[PDB]
Every structure is written in C-alpha cells, then in structure tokens.
Copies of this chain bind each other. A is one copy, B any other.
Amino acid sequence: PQTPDEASLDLAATDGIRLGDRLRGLWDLRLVGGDAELPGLPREGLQLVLDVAPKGRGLIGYLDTPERLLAAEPPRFRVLGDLLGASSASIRWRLVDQASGSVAPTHDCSAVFDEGDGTLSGRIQRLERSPLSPNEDFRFVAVKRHFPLAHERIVLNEKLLGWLVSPQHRLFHQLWHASRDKWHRLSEKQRNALRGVGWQPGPLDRERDARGPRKDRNASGIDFFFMHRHMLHTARSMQDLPSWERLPRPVVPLEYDRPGFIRYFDNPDGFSVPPAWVAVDDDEYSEWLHGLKSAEAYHANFLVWESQYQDPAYLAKLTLGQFGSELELGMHDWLHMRWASVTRDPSNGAPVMTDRFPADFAPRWFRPENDFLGDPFSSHVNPVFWSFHGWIDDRIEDWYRAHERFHPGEVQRREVEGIQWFAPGRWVEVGDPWLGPATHDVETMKLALRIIFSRRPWYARNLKLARDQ
C-alpha cells in the first residue's frame, strides 16, 4: 500500500459531528483506583470540560476543579486529542501538564461513551510509567452535567404560570394556529364545521388563511402580529417579561473564552441554545434541527433577520400584513425550534423521543412540566417564548418608524381591543385582527381541533433543507 501524496480538507462527517456533540460540554469527573490520582488535584469533585468545533475533528478541553476551570489562570491539565477512528466505543486524548512549563503529554486517556446526559468511563496511563510494568489501576468516570432547562433558570410566578398552562389557554393557542395554517387545505365540510363553532380564521365567509397562495396579501400577517401583542399585553400585566434587545449569540468556543463557554452550558439566563438531539428514524429532521441550532445558521439566517427587520428601507416596502406573514413563515418557526429542548414526559419530565399527537389531550400533557417550544399547545409556557416574541413585537415599531420616514402620515396609530395598534390604510389591510371567537369553551376547542386533525413537532412540519445540506 502507498501513503497519501497530499492532504485534503477533512471536515467531520455526521458520525464525527454527533460524537463531538456528545462530548461538548461540562462533565463531573471522578477518579477510581489504587493509582488513581493526578498531581496537585483531588480524586473526587473534579470536572472535565470538552469542546469540538461544529465540523472539527480535534478534541480540546481542560481538567481541574470547578473553580479553577472558571478562573482566569490556566487550569492544571489541558486536553488534546483527535477523533480519527473514534466513536462511542473509543475516545482518546492526552493530558498536558500546564504547570510543568512543558506541553509534552503526561497522561494517556481512553474512554467509552454510554447513555445526566451521558457518561464517559475509562482508564488513564502515566506516560512516565513503562507499559512493561504491572497494569496500573487508574480509572475515571465522567458524568456530563444536565443542560438546565429554560424554566429551571427563568421562573414564571404562579399567577402568570397558572394562566399559561390552563387547558383553556393551551387549546386556544393550538387551535388559533391550527385553524390559520390548515384552512387552505381543509374541505368546506371542515370549514363549515369550524364556522359553526365560530373558530374560522378571521371574518366569517372572508377567512384569512395564513399559509395559502394569497397568504402574503390576505392580511393574515396582521392576525399574527396582533394576537401575540395581545398575549404580551396580558402576560406582562402579571410579570415583567422584557423583550430581547438583541438575539443571543452562539456559545463562544472554548479556545477563546473558557469561563464563558463553561457558563453557557449552565444556561444561566435561560437564553442558551439547547443542544440538538437525534430524532428516531428521521435523519432529515435531525439534520434540519442541528443546522438550525448551529452557529453558522445564526450568522446565515438569524443575524440576517435581525438586520432586515430593523432596516427602515427594508420595512418601508412591506404592509403590516406582508411583514407579519414574512416573519411568521420564516423567522418565527425557526425561533421556536432553535431554543427548543427535547420533549419531556409531562408527569415526571423525563426526556421522550416522540412528540405529542395533536389530537391527544390526555390530562398529563396539560401539566406545567410540558413547556415544549415545538408545539403551540405548550410553547407559550416556555420562558424563552416571551423573550423572542417580545423582540418580534418590538419590530412592529421599527415598521411604523420605517413608514413615518418614507411615507410620513400614511400609517396612523390607533387603540384596538385596548392595545396600541394602527388604523386601516394603505399599509394596514384590515382593522379586525383575529383573536378567536372573541373577535369573530374547552370541549368546543377539542372538537374543533379534532375536525382539523382527526411525526415531527408543529413548528417543524414545514421544514426544508438547503440544497447544500
């Protein structure tokens, strides 16, 4: 056999990427064995921090006490390895003695990954010791620290929380979305049935489908913006819910800000991106969710949306309906899934792979534990829901200021349903935003939802991969 004549760009494949995702994060480390000890370190209460670039194949990290990993001084031990030929069955890396003034490795580490979000267990070898000596007893078990959920870091008081998780509010939110999004694909038999219970989207016999051919010019976007502004108004009367001023930036890689990287995985402000998960027998959705949560998706899509929707020249070209429709079909769904964490069983919160069936109204799904962002039946319960929906709502004023600049006086402010809104005109197609039957009963909403429905999350049903993906 002949060796390679040159090198090529060796970006990680799916297996290597997923492996790096399993390793990336903060681990609670424990050393076991008669010879299990590291110079100037205790045996228990240690931590291991690992990182791998989104498509990288090298492995970096540090090993020390929790306090020294967050300290500014270089940690005692540094991790250097690579994932060539690696897998859940074999991960290797060396430790570097950063206090010896030398980068030469002092230990050889090998581990196996088992599925608390994961476990690494293996052996450590002192490189100064000869392999011809009796096998040394130097083991370690590292447990990956739980990635804190949004509700574990942003607490919603009982009054607000009681209003969000109530069966009345959950079904309203789901049916309000379901009626808009499905109307264009419902038969008139289904339409007349929803009309019979007053749950048609918009004025009767003049309904405003949100995802049909004329979705951008039928004023459906106005129902989108207003309903959430109405939700923000009532929700903010029960608790201070500040909007995002800017979109959260992706995690800083470990090589440039070690404490910030470590702090990110504690989700301190609840605005961290939950790491993507792998869906059972659905690589298309797993790839889509992964990219949507990636850093390059922030720089390619989210950062663009943040720019466009604060650009007067860009907003002044859109009616309030065009703006709402454009933002809902693109940014809105992606916001939910970027910050979505895995669906948890409502009764105890254990991670579950399956998503709730839309017409499944078992009493457990209504528990406060279910705040899954991928389903409007529960997304409003997540604290992050209000942060980026406040951000969206604030962009309406950028839209108003955009037109006051290029079309002064053509858009008029006006109070609608006790909410700061705008009067109909050249840039406001309608003056009757749809808030459900109130503007145009639990068991009734269930019957309506059953008419519409009677496997991926709701906000992932329209997922589309790029040609390059």
| B405 contacts A131, C-beta separation under 8 Å | yes
B10 touches A304 (CB 8 A): yes
Query: Is A167 engaged at the interface, CB distance under 8 Å to the other chain?
Result: no
Instruction: Answer whether residue A4 sits at the interface, using C-beta atoms and an 8 A cutoff.
Output: yes
The 8 Å CB contact of A9, one of B5, B84, B297, B312, is: B297
Question: Are B257 and A249 closer than 8 Å at their CB atoms?
Answer: no
Of A190-198, A328-336, A416-424, the segment with at least 4 beta carbons within 8 Å of chain B is A328-336
Task: Confirm or deny: A256 has a beta carbon within 8 angstroms of a beta carbon on chain B.
Answer: yes
Contacts of A249 in B (CB 8 A): 255-256
List CB contacts (< 8 Å) of A227-251 with chain B: 245-246, 249
Separation in Å of the A3 CB from the closest CB of chain B? Answer: 4
Instruction: Please state if B307 and A82 are interface contacts (CB–CB under 8 Å).
Output: yes
Within the complex, the shortest CB–CB distance from A72 to chain B, in Å, comes to 14
A3 engages B303 (CB within 8 Å)? no
Give 6 closest A-B pairs by Cβ, nearest first. Answer: A56-B299, A58-B303, A53-B299, A7-B330, A82-B307, A252-B256
9 contacts between A and B (CB under 8 A): A2-B216, A4-B330, A9-B466, A11-B296, A11-B300, A82-B308, A94-B310, A105-B310, A132-B408
Binding site for B on A (CB under 8 A): 2-12, 52-60, 80-82, 84, 92-94, 103-105, 108, 127, 130-132, 211, 213, 215-216, 245-246, 249, 252, 255-257, 260, 291-292, 295-297, 299-301, 303-304, 306-308, 310-313, 322, 325-326, 329-331, 333-334, 398, 401, 405-406, 408, 462-466, 468-469
